């Protein structure tokens, strides 16, 4: 009963075993959307090329996330959405990690709170973000999501160009989840095809506003789709264990009851549609 459940939750808890000193530093307060949603130090992304004499200079609110139920599948970075003060930091992260696919699970403003400052130029335009140039080479929309094709280079070396594929989900409800999972499944299918075409690509960057709710939901669904793709349709799927495994890497991943239930709904539909496709004729 109660005490057994409590002891189970306690044992499962690992927030007390992993510090978050860097994110709590007063020097980094303007770099966090929420003072209590912070990266673990052990798994945080450390920005390169920064001066250690500038307090906090290496900090971004983002963590590496791997499917650690597996023997050391794609890897991820779970990140918060940019603030004005952190747009350049975000590009430094994308460049240094060799990320070629970015998954943004929010609109910039969702009536009417700022969820992410934009970090791309408009179509056909080129902008500087710190030591990088970013060009928007085109936008292609579906009803639920947008693909923005970016080209990024160091400011000084325009000959060195990386294509980065920016997938933005547009129809995720504010303070809820999609009413059906088909849009997210289609989105993740496109993202997966792109990443698999780029075998040397770095981790996929996934972000929302705080980088734990929609971000954790998307990463967990994608991890389970990867397990099913690789291990097969009747492989063991343990959603609760997968969620705990991701929460050990960034606290609070999959934040709401609606998100938790949506993972089940999405994976159920993925399995059922996959089976139906196999059984045709």
């Amino acid at each position: 009963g109660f005490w057994e459940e409590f002891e189970s939750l306690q044992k499962q808890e690992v927030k007390n075993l992993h510090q978050r000193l860097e994110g709590q530093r007063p020097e980094n307060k303007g770099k966090n959307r929420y003072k209590n949603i912070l990266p673990f130090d052990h798994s945080r992304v450390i920005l390169q090329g920064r001066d250690s004499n500038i307090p906090g200079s290496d900090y971004i609110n983002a963590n590496y996330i791997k499917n650690q139920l597996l023997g050391p599948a794609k890897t991820y970075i779970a990140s918060q959405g940019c603030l004005e003060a952190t747009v350049n930091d975000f590009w430094q992260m994308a460049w240094q990690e060799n990320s070629r696919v970015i998954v943004m699970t929010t609109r910039e403003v969702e009536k009417g709170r700022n969820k992410c400052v934009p970090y791309w130029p408009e179509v056909g335009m080129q902008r500087a973000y710190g030591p990088y140039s970013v060009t928007n080479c085109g936008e292609h929309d579906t009803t639920e999501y947008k693909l923005r094709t970016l080209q990024v280079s160091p400011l000084d070396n325009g000959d060195l160009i990386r294509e980065i594929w920016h997938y933005q989900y547009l129809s995720w409800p504010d303070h809820g989840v999609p009413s059906e999972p088909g849009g997210v499944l289609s989105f993740l299918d496109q993202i997966n095809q792109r990443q698999e075409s780029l075998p040397h690509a770095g981790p996929i960057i996934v972000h929302c506003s705080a980088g734990i709710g929609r971000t954790g939901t998307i990463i967990v669904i994608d991890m389970l789709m990867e397990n099913i793709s690789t291990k097969g349709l009747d492989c063991d799927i343990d959603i609760q264990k997968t969620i705990q495994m991701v929460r050990a890497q960034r606290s609070g991943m999959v934040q709401t009851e609606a998100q938790y239930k949506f993972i089940y709904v999405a994976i159920a539909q993925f399995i059922e549609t996959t089976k139906k496709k196999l059984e045709v004729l």
Side-chain angles (χ1 to χ4, degrees), residues 80-112:
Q80 90 179 1
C82 295
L83 295 163
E84 185 170 10
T86 67
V87 170
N88 295 345
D89 296 335
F90 183 88
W91 278 114
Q92 172 58 38
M93 171 169 73
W95 187 268
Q96 72 182 42
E97 299 300 325
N98 196 38
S99 299
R100 306 301 182 105
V101 182
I102 303 171
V103 178
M104 174 169 181
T105 64
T106 58
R107 291 174 291 155
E108 295 157 60
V109 189
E110 294 179 350
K111 341 247 178 182

Side-chain angles (χ1 to χ4, degrees), residues 176-213:
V177 295
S179 67
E180 42 72 48
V184 168
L185 294 172
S186 169
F187 183 68
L188 288 176
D189 174 57
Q190 293 298 317
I191 290 157
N192 186 65
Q193 290 186 51
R194 181 72 62 180
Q195 179 79 358
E196 68 169 8
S197 73
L198 301 163
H200 303 300
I204 299 180
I205 294 166
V206 182
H207 73 86
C208 50
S209 199
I212 58 171

Side-chain angles (χ1 to χ4, degrees), residues 23-229:
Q24 295 167 330
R25 296 174 65 170
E27 49 262 48
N28 288 329
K29 77 190 174 76
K31 300 179 197 175
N32 298 317
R33 289 188 172 266
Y34 300 95
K35 73 195 278 192
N36 54 342
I37 298 179
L38 300 179
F40 292 130
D41 291 335
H42 78 270
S43 58
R44 75 186 181 102
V45 178
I46 303 177
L47 300 177
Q48 298 171 359
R50 302 292 173 97
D51 185 351
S52 62
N53 288 329
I54 296 285
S57 60
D58 73 8
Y59 178 79
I60 189 167
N61 194 323
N63 294 90
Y64 303 106
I65 313 290
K66 294 178 181 52
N67 178 0
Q68 280 171 352
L69 292 174
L70 303 194
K74 60 169 83 72
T75 64
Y76 314 83
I77 289 167
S79 182
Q80 90 179 1
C82 295
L83 295 163
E84 185 170 10
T86 67
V87 170
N88 295 345
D89 296 335
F90 183 88
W91 278 114
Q92 172 58 38
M93 171 169 73
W95 187 268
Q96 72 182 42
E97 299 300 325
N98 196 38
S99 299
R100 306 301 182 105
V101 182
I102 303 171
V103 178
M104 174 169 181
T105 64
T106 58
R107 291 174 291 155
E108 295 157 60
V109 189
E110 294 179 350
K111 341 247 178 182
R113 280 115 190 270
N114 293 278
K115 293 208 166 293
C116 183
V117 173
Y119 47 90
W120 56 89
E122 295 302 290
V123 168
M125 310 299 251
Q126 184 184 209
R127 294 200 64 75
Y129 299 97
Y132 304 103
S133 157
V134 175
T135 302
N136 179 337
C137 299
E139 290 173 16
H140 303 268
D141 295 357
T142 70
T143 62
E144 311 313 299
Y145 57 85
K146 172 186 294 287
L147 168 60
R148 180 176 280 110
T149 61
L150 302 178
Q151 290 183 8
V152 184
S153 71
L155 261 189
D156 65 12
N157 197 350
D159 295 337
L160 186 64
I161 300 168
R162 298 183 184 169
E163 295 182 302
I164 293 177
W165 308 90
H166 184 250
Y167 288 88
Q168 182 182 13
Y169 203 83
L170 304 169
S171 64
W172 195 302
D174 185 42
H175 276 60
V177 295
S179 67
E180 42 72 48
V184 168
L185 294 172
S186 169
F187 183 68
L188 288 176
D189 174 57
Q190 293 298 317
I191 290 157
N192 186 65
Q193 290 186 51
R194 181 72 62 180
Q195 179 79 358
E196 68 169 8
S197 73
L198 301 163
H200 303 300
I204 299 180
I205 294 166
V206 182
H207 73 86
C208 50
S209 199
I212 58 171
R214 299 177 192 181
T215 292
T217 301
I218 283 279
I219 287 174
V220 171
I221 292 169
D222 194 64
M223 284 183 173
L224 295 166
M225 284 167 76
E226 179 95 342
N227 298 344
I228 294 167
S229 163

